[PDB]
Design a binder for these strands. Structure first.
Ligand SMILES: [K+]
Ligand SMILES: [K+]
Ligand SMILES: [K+]
Ligand SMILES: [K+]
Ligand SMILES: [K+]
Ligand SMILES: [K+]
Ligand SMILES: [K+]
Ligand SMILES: [K+]
Ligand SMILES: [K+]
Ligand SMILES: [Mg+2]
Ligand SMILES: [Mg+2]
Ligand SMILES: [Mg+2]
Ligand SMILES: [Mg+2]
Ligand SMILES: [Mg+2]
Ligand SMILES: [Mg+2]
Ligand SMILES: [Mg+2]
Ligand SMILES: [Mg+2]
Ligand SMILES: [Mg+2]
Ligand SMILES: [Mg+2]
Ligand SMILES: [Mg+2]
Ligand SMILES: [Mg+2]
Ligand SMILES: [Mg+2]
Ligand SMILES: [Mg+2]
Ligand SMILES: [Mg+2]
Ligand SMILES: [Mg+2]
Ligand SMILES: [Mg+2]
Lengths: 65, 271, 88, 56, 106, 129
RNA sequence: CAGAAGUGUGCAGC
RNA sequence: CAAGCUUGAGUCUCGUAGAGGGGGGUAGAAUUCCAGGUGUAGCGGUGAAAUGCGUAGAGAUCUGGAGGAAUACCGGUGGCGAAGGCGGCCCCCUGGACGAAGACUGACGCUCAGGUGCGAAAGCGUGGGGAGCAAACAGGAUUAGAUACCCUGGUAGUCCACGCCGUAAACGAUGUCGACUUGGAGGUUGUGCCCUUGAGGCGUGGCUUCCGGAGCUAACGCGUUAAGUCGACCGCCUGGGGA
């Protein structure tokens, strides 16, 4: 099931790093919604938020750097 | 814009001309003109020292300000003007104290634009700063090679220099030839590119159009007799020589730079 | 696109009411307003072909509305085209 | 994929973890995918055929 | 006027100057009849990957309502201001006075 | 766009009776009411009704015999692309006279048998088997 | 990893 | 021909989703090259080789720099667009679609010869850029030969700006528009009601994937997104080659 629909989130925030770290692998790759169960609309919001957080160096692009 | 002339005669068939309506349709600012009599390529011995120079239209010299040393006073562009002495156009600018000067017109600058020189000028085209104050990666023109000597690099139409690196006392410049060169960072440069970048697109339609610019015909060495040129002679069209200059030095590949005193400033030759 | 307050201006200027947003005069006025506004766009983004297809839709719809109005009432037609400056 | 070997962890258990980790990360598959170019038409064809076979 | 969220981060050595930049930029907005709905200073925070070999950049976040030209002025001053190492302007659906999770984590 | 509402009515009849519909509903129109009246007189339908004031619907109750459609076939003949008119001496006989043709004569919509008895031609709307 | 070619033309089963 | 009407067709008000378009910035991973340190005889490639690179110090490894191109994961028989097509992130300008509730105009509509616009890739012109890849071409192999397949290199080109070209299995091999006719399982995006108790129940729109009924079809199959039952308009075919 999808956490964001159970909460009723209006928009995922790239600043909520505590949330976003649940949806990336330890290598920093975005986890597929197939695994998380996230509804597609929220999966797209996740992807955009994570990419923004990456640009701000709040999350890594890669495991290594 | 560039326009192709209609072929109403065989001399017009191939003419392509640059038309610029922003150029001033009037006489230049006379207090900044001087005489500029033609040499014909002859030195103080009266000998021809540079072939193929001579004739062409009469011209007056415009005193362009390459030093831009009038720091801290704003100037407004009065108008753009034609200059016969160079490929770039020049802008007449008026300072807040009522001084007038000519400058190289940068790309996109227009009448009524406001420009300033000095260590605290804004980063915008036509402003002039010491290169230690210019962000690395900026595009500049009219670069000084020695502090206070005036701009010598990137003066022709559409040319520019890119600041690649800074090392405290020196900056590394990529010159328009592709040479990488050090210059000391107190040298000034002007932001932007030299305008008239479409200069290179014109086509002179006819032989006479080269004569107007003061270029005389270039006789091929192979067409001469052996006494005149190393390529001369032959009972027909013969060659069989290696190509050389009129004075016997190999052309088509032999290098000729020999200037050990400046080599330290050159990071990587052109490619 | 054309903003809300500009829309209300045009509607209240050419229509009988703030209600009569369906009147042919009001529709032609709104179309002319947006066609005029977009000229400043395509003067620069010349290769924005996709937006130009919408522009041409507006143009042809205005044409059809004017042909209708000219059939119904030549007087209203004349007033409209003179006020908006249409037909060159 | 990174493994830190714990104190008193057997080395072959560390190898098991490394193997499973790098398999789960898909690194080898991604390397094999990129050694040769594939026309976009071929990518779409393979995707379509895979989807077509995913039916009971 | 449009709402924008602006995050900019500053070379750590310039941290003590952050109050100065803020006062300038907060002026530049408000002097243009813009308004600032909130400002959060996160201090030095560790980077996920090195940029310019730096670490521990000083983050600042603000939410603002302003006209376009004031915000492109602000972004073009960030461009040449060597203290600012990274910057982001994002237009926002609404004004947002609520403090970020990054502050409320404190 | 809709350009032949009579062929629309006939197609609704054909389809509804192939689907074993009990009744079919369509937009009403004077000519539709006239044609339905003729069909009811010839017994091809059980009943028809018109309902509503601003946007009147017309309902036809379809007829079945021994579990099968009473309407064997129903075919538009005059159509917008090609109008068909016949003189008195040329009125067609459908199924050698077991079916009907519907003719808009100058005296109104009627069967071809009626039109022959009256001595009239007209526009031939449709054949019904 | 390599492995090419096979002339023309016919007739019953009603 | 005149005057009506609101169901077709449009305008307005409030929101939603989206790789829709044009312009400008910018980030990270990686390839290549250049400088420098460590370090010793191989590397690379193949079915196996050789050409090639290497003691003039390669390959490997670490530090720094330059430059071009494309955006892993997300990613889905997912979305958008008339079609061709469109995929990192941010800003500016900009087109269309859809849903709820009304209000407004009052047939203003459908199709379209000629005409006009858009139109992948390759190709052409002028000026730039050039990492990787790669027609042509060179060498090594393979083979009876090998003007190929494989290997080592490599030019136009691929990228950018502004013009031209106007074709593709440009395909759903299926013209546009409108109405009617048993169902089932899913995807995606609005919206209403119900204790909203949720990871909930029931309705109502848009688009889309797969089965299958009547019917149709030479058959294969299509099957409410028809190739079923009808209407309007347009384009096209008339034995195979020649062509
Ligand atoms: K004088
Ligand atoms: K010559
Ligand atoms: K000779
Ligand atoms: K949009
Ligand atoms: K045509
Ligand atoms: K290659
Ligand atoms: K052979
Ligand atoms: K090349
Ligand atoms: K024939
Ligand atoms: Mg010469
Ligand atoms: Mg010459
Ligand atoms: Mg001679
Ligand atoms: Mg000699
Ligand atoms: Mg000879
Ligand atoms: Mg043979
Ligand atoms: Mg044989
Ligand atoms: Mg929009
Ligand atoms: Mg191309
Ligand atoms: Mg080209
Ligand atoms: Mg070229
Ligand atoms: Mg090859
Ligand atoms: Mg064709
Ligand atoms: Mg076809
Ligand atoms: Mg089926
Ligand atoms: Mg059909
Ligand atoms: Mg034939």
């Amino acid at each position: 099931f999808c956490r964001f629909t159970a909460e009723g989130v209006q928009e995922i925030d790239y600043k909520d790093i505590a949330t976003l770290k649940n949806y990336i692998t330890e290598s920093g790759k975005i986890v597929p919604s197939r695994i998380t169960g996230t509804r597609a609309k929220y999966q797209r919001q996740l992807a955009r938020a994570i990419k923004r957080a990456r640009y701000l160096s709040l999350l890594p692009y890669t495991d290594r750097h | 814009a560039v326009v192709k002339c209609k072929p109403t005669s065989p001399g017009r068939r191939h003419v392509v001309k640059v038309v610029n309506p922003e150029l001033h349709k009037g006489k230049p600012f006379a207090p900044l003109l001087e005489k500029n009599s033609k040499s014909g390529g002859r030195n103080n011995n009266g000998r021809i020292t540079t072939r193929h120079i001579g004739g062409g239209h009469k011209q007056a010299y415009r005193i362009v300000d390459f030093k831009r040393n009038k720091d801290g006073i704003p100037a407004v562009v009065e108008r753009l003007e034609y200059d016969p002495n160079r490929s770039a156009n020049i802008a007449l600018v008026l300072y807040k104290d009522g001084e007038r000067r000519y400058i190289l017109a940068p790309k996109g600058l227009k009448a009524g634009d406001q420009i300033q020189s000095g260590v605290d000028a804004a980063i915008k085209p036509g402003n002039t700063l010491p290169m230690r104050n210019i962000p690395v990666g900026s595009t500049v023109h009219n670069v000084e090679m020695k502090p206070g000597k005036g701009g010598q690099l990137a003066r022709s139409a559409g040319t520019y220099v890119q600041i690649v690196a800074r090392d405290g006392a020196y900056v590394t410049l990529r010159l328009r030839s592709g040479e990488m060169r050090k210059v000391e960072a107190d040298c000034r440069a002007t932001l932007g590119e030299v305008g008239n970048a479409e200069h290179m697109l014109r086509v002179l339609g006819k032989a006479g159009a080269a004569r107007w610019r003061g270029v005389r015909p270039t006789v091929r060495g192979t067409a001469m007799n052996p006494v005149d040129h190393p390529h001369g002679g032959g009972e027909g069209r013969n060659f069989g020589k290696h190509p050389v200059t009129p004075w016997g030095v190999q052309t088509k590949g032999k290098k000729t730079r020999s200037n050990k005193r400046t080599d330290k400033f050159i990071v990587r030759r052109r490619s | 696109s054309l903003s809300t307050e500009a829309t209300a201006k045009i509607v209240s200027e050419f229509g009988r009411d703030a209600n009569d947003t369906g009147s042919t005069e009001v529709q032609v006025a709104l179309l002319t307003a947006q066609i005029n506004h977009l000229q400043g766009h395509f003067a620069e983004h010349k290769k924005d072909h996709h937006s130009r297809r919408g522009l041409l839709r507006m143009v042809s719809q205005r044409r059809k509305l004017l042909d209708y109005l000219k059939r119904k009432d030549v007087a209203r037609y004349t007033q409209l085209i003179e006020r908006l400056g249409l037909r060159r | 994929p990174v493994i830190k070997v714990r104190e008193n962890e057997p080395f072959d258990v560390a190898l098991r973890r490394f193997k499973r980790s790098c398999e789960k990360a898909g690194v080898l598959a991604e390397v094999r995918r990129r050694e040769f170019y594939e026309k976009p038409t071929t990518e779409r064809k393979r995707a379509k055929a895979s989807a077509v076979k995913r039916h009971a | 006027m449009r709402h924008y969220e602006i995050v900019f981060m500053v070379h750590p050595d310039q941290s003590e100057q952050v109050p100065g930049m803020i006062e300038r930029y907060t002026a530049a907005i408000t002097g243009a009849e813009g308004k600032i709905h909130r400002l959060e200073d996160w201090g030095r925070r560790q980077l996920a990957y090195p940029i310019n070999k730096l670490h521990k950049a000083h983050y600042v976040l603000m939410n603002v309502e302003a006209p376009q030209e004031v915000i492109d002025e602000l972004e073009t001053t960030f461009r040449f201001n060597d203290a600012v190492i990274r910057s982001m302007v994002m237009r926002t659906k609404h004004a947002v006075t609520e403090a970020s999770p990054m502050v409320k984590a404190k | 766009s809709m350009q032949d509402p009579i062929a629309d009515m006939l197609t609704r009849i054909r389809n509804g009776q192939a689907a074993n519909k009990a009744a079919v509903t369509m937009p009403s129109s004077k000519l539709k009411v006239a044609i339905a009246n003729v069909l009811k007189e010839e017994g091809f339908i059980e009943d028809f009704k018109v309902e509503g004031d601003t946007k009147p619907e017309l309902e036809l109750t379809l007829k079945y015999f021994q579990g099968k459609a009473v309407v064997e076939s129903i075919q538009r003949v005059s159509r917008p692309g090609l109008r068909i008119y016949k003189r008195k001496d040329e009125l067609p006989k459908v199924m050698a006279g077991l079916g009907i043709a519907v003719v808009s004569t100058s005296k109104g919509v009627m069967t071809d048998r009626a039109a022959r008895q009256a001595g009239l031609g007209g526009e031939i709307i449709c054949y019904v088997a």
